[model samples]
Target chain A: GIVEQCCTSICSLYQLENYCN
Target chain B: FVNQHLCASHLVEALYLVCGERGFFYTPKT
Candidate 1:
């Protein structure tokens, strides 16, 4: 069975975008 | 497995719009 995934953060849109992609 | 999109879209999409005018007056035109 494949396990589910999750993430947590409180960063700005630009910051998140940078680290995300 | 772990991932996120802060702005995810399992099926994402984006749109932008703009408006412009010339030779126009805003109310009380002469």
Candidate 2:
């Protein structure tokens, strides 16, 4: 599911970022 | 954009890494 899930909408918001709650 | 494709690729790389794959993949949707 590499390419499959890569361009997925769920992945649309994810990136290599520093996150916190 | 190319960056989306590339970032997707890197995320895929991260995914494969998550799947216990230690190899490097040099190609995707080209």
Candidate 3:
């Protein structure tokens, strides 16, 4: 997966917590 | 995809309880 951008995209869509995998 | 599957399964089990046994297909094996 792509690095920094994906962390926000995937986690944000699901409304996930800060420490996402 | 895996998270979505788990979420949907959780919803199903929750709905099954809320709607009662008659609303869903199930038995001991389910």
Candidate 4:
């Protein structure tokens, strides 16, 4: 699971979206 | 994590297609 401060913003989410799934 | 690959197929029969993946080993059931 991935969350914001996700290292907010879902728009910026896709790149780091679950990098290590 | 199985991503939406460039080619998609059922894991049961087509798992062989994703060749070289460590998580798969099937002997082609007769």
Model 2 score (lDDT): 0.41
| lDDT (10s digit) by residue, model 3, range A1-21 | 212322323324323222122
B1-30 per-residue lDDT for model 4 (tens digits): 734322212333333333334344332231
- lDDT, candidate 1, at B3: 41
Best by DockQ: 2
Runs of candidate 1 exceeding 4 Å displacement:
A1-9, B1-30
Superposed by TM-score, candidate 2 places the C-alpha of residue B24 at a distance from the truth, in angstroms, of: 15
DockQ of each: 0.03, 0.11, 0.03, 0.03
For model 2, what is the alpha-carbon lDDT of residue B25?
48
Best by TM-score: 3
What DockQ score does model 1 reach against the true complex? 0.03
Give per-residue CA lDDT, model 1, range B1-30, as digits (tens).
434422233212210111122121222111
Note the residue pairs that clash in candidate 2.
Answer: none
Better of 1 and 3 by TM-score: 3
- In terms of docking quality, model 4 is incorrect
Per-residue lDDT tens digits for candidate 2, residues B1-30, read 344542444665664554453444434463
Better of 1 and 2 by lDDT: 2
User: Which ten contiguous residues of candidate 3 chain B have the minimum total lDDT?
Assistant: B21-30
Model 4 agreement with the true structure over A1-21: per-residue lDDT tens digits: 122212122313233322322
Position A8, candidate 1: lDDT: 33
